[PDB]
Amino acid sequence: DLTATDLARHRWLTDNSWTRPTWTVAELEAAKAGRTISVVLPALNEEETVGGVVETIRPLLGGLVDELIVLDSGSTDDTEIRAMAAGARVISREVALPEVAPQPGKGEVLWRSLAATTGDIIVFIDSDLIDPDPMFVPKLVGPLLLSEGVHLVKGFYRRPGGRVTELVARPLLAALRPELTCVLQPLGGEYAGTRELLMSVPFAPGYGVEIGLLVDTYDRLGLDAIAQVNLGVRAHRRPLTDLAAMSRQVIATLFSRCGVPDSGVGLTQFLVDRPPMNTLRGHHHHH
Amino acid sequence: TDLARHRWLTDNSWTRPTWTVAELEAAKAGRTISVVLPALNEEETVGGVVETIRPLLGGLVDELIVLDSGSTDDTEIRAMAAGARVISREVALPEVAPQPGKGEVLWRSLAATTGDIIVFIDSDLIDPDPMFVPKLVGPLLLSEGVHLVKGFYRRPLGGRVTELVARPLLAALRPELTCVLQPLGGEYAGTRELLMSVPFAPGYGVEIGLLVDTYDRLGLDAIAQVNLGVRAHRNRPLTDLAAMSRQVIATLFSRCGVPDSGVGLTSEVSLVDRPPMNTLRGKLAAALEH
Numbered sequence: 146d147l148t149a150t151d152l153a154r155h156r157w158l159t160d161n162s163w164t165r166p167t168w169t170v171a172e173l174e175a176a177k178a179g180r181t182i183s184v185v186l187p188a189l190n191e192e193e194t195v196g197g198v199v200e201t202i203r204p205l206l207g208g209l210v211d212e213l214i215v216l217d218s219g220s221t222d223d224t225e226i227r228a229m230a231a232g233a234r235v236i237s238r239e240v241a242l243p244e245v246a247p248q249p250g251k252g253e254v255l256w257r258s259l260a261a262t263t264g265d266i267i268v269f270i271d272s273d274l275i276d277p278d279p280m281f282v283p284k285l286v287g288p289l290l291l292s293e294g295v296h297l298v299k300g301f302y303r304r305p306g307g308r309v310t311e312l313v314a315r316p317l318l319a320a321l322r323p324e325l326t327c328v329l330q331p332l333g334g335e336y337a338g339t340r341e342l343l344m345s346v347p348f349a350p351g352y353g354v355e356i357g358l359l360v361d362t363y364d365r366l367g368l369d370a371i372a373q374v375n376l377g378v379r380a381h382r383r384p385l386t387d388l389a390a391m392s393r394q395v396i397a398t399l400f401s402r403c404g405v406p407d408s409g410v411g412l413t414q415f416l417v418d419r420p421p422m423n424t425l426r427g428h429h430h431h432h
Numbered sequence: 433t434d435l436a437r438h439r440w441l442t443d444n445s446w447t448r449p450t451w452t453v454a455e456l457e458a459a460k461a462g463r464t465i466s467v468v469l470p471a472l473n474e475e476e477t478v479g480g481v482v483e484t485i486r487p488l489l490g491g492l493v494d495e496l497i498v499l500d501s502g503s504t505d506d507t508e509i510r511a512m513a514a515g516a517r518v519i520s521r522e523v524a525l526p527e528v529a530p531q532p533g534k535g536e537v538l539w540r541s542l543a544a545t546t547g548d549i550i551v552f553i554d555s556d557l558i559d560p561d562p563m564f565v566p567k568l569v570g571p572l573l574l575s576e577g578v579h580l581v582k583g584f585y586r587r588p589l590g591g592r593v594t595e596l597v598a599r600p601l602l603a604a605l606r607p608e609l610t611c612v613l614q615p616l617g618g619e620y621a622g623t624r625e626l627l628m629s630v631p632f633a634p635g636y637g638v639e640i641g642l643l644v645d646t647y648d649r650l651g652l653d654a655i656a657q658v659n660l661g662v663r664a665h666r667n668r669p670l671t672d673l674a675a676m677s678r679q680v681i682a683t684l685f686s687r688c689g690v691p692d693s694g695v696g697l698t699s700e701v702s703l704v705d706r707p708p709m710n711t712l713r714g715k716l717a718a719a720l721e722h
């Protein structure tokens with residue numbers, strides 16, 4: 146028979162998941178009600194794709210989208226200049242948050258982007274996407290603009306998740322936070338959140354950032370605050386060593402949130418969380 | 433940190449085991465060896481695996497058993513024709529109702545065998561080699577202090593569950609054990625002393641549970657590994673691998689005291705070990721304490 150996890154999943158899908166997120170750009174603009182929207186593309190040596198991603202979002206600039214920023218992580222290729230020519234604002238880690246020395250990894254970039262943006266809603270889109278669709282941003286912000294109580298929207302793709310998602314993230318969530326197994330692509334890089342939420346949570350480093358944000362949001366607000374939207378079809382993207390490193394950090398970040406100690410020992414082959422940005426810039430009682 | 437891993441690889445890992453069958457037979461020193469093949473609906477491959485081991489029966493190997501887990505194909509008759517004794521779960525341990533999964537089968541075989549050394553070999557192997565059992569027992573017979581030998585396969589120039597799930601989780605929770613190349617492998621040998629005294633995890637958790645319990649109780653130097661030869665990674669459906677991963681997680685969490693919800697994947701998940709076989713077969717166990 147059904148479990149409590151099953152029952153919650155079914156109703157969460159009914160209320161908080163959209164297979165056909167067909168809101169129009171015009172209706173979303175009309176719903177902003179004074180809120181502004183920032184779009185952030187984290188980038189490190191993505192010269193072949195960053196411009197193409199920017200180009201798909203640029204038509205929204207000045208209407209639905211208020212700012213379009215490429216947060217560069219120290220690229221040595223032509224990422225920055227291609228993002229400039231394509232119509233984005235390029236901001237380095239150092240300019241985004243001058244008072245803190247950078248550390249490596251994606252989570253650092255997304256955290257710093259909170260200091261460099263002003264939008265009430267922040268949308269993250271990976272800069273390595275080959276086939277970005279222009280409706281990604283509208284779909285991601287729909288539930289934030291139209292659905293009471295939602296603070297985090299995860300974009301998922303139908304396929305014509307991957308290995309880390311299905312072997313590592315979802316099974317560990319089943320063990321530790323089973324309600325969150327309803328989220329189809331918990332590691333996805335296309336997602337949006339409110340400034341209120343994102344400024345208030347720590348940011349995990351590196352490959353842990355997505356899972357960390359998902360679990361921190363759940364632990365504070367539960368499923369009601371999390372939604373997901375189908376962004377369309379896309380094929381699964383990596384070398385096993387990259388995936389194993391990803392997994393190891395997903396494990397470390399989940400463990401840090403779920404009361405499991407971690408040796409700190411990285412993968413044998415043959416760094417810390419950043420505090421909430423509201424400690425530097427700018428309820429759901431259990432009683 | 434890698435100092436410990438380096439010394440263990442130098443002393444407890446063999447990429448090219450030299451041992452001959454005759455040398456191993458001469459080292460038995462009165463110990464006996466049982467070989468157990470768990471099998472559920474493996475009619476296509478079980479006979480071929482048995483045939484590679486049968487020439488050792490009466491010499492290096494004292495018992496050769498297929499522990500059938502409820503097959504409805506021709507697994508049993510084909511294993512018998514190849515020279516194995518076929519034992520059902522019920523015959524192995526008649527007064528205890530069977531539960532599903534591989535760990536149950538390996539645990540029950542302890543009550544149906546007499547060896548001082550028990551060797552487990554999967555019955556679904558497509559390309560078995562007759563030197564598997566010799567290589568697995570070498571460190572038990574010729575080294576001192578080894579109680580568990582893990583057979584690994586060199587890969588042409590482990591799988592996704594091994595590299596994305598088992599090894600990273602061991603790095604987090606039992607960091608020395610990342611030195612074991614293929615912790616989830618189904619070809620391994622253990623002493624009766626060890627195997628009779630530890631709980632057995634259910635289903636797909638049995639291998640990692642035995643590895644972790646051996647490590648904790650007897651130490652790193654009680655574990656060895658041997659290269660069984662080059663074997664290509666087996667391609668399994670992602671849903672099967674995900675179910676395996678979920679049970680590996682459950683078993684490791686049990687061994688660490690992490691609350692696991694028991695919730696499976698939208699898949700079977702048990703958190704309940706079988707107790708040490710010496711609790712149910714105390715007189716058998718005492719007879720084999722030697």
Ligand SMILES: O=c1ccn([C@@H]2O[C@H](COP(=O)(O)OP(=O)(O)O)[C@@H](O)[C@H]2O)c(=O)[nH]1
Nearest residue numbers: 187188189191218249250251254271272273
């Ligand atoms: O330190 C990093 C790593 C990645 N990325 C970006 O984050 C996205 C995801 O990259 P990936 O997960 O492949 O990171 P990597 O595998 O290169 O560490 C892409 O848009 C990268 O350019 C980034 O800005 N900084």
Ligand SMILES: O=c1ccn([C@@H]2O[C@H](COP(=O)(O)OP(=O)(O)O)[C@@H](O)[C@H]2O)c(=O)[nH]1
Nearest residue numbers: 470471472474501532533534537554555556
């Ligand atoms: O409940 C079970 C599950 C598996 N096995 C055996 O254990 C090995 C690994 O099991 P798996 O299910 O991965 O192999 P498959 O059944 O897919 O061939 C094989 O020799 C199986 O026949 C068994 O005896 N009982």
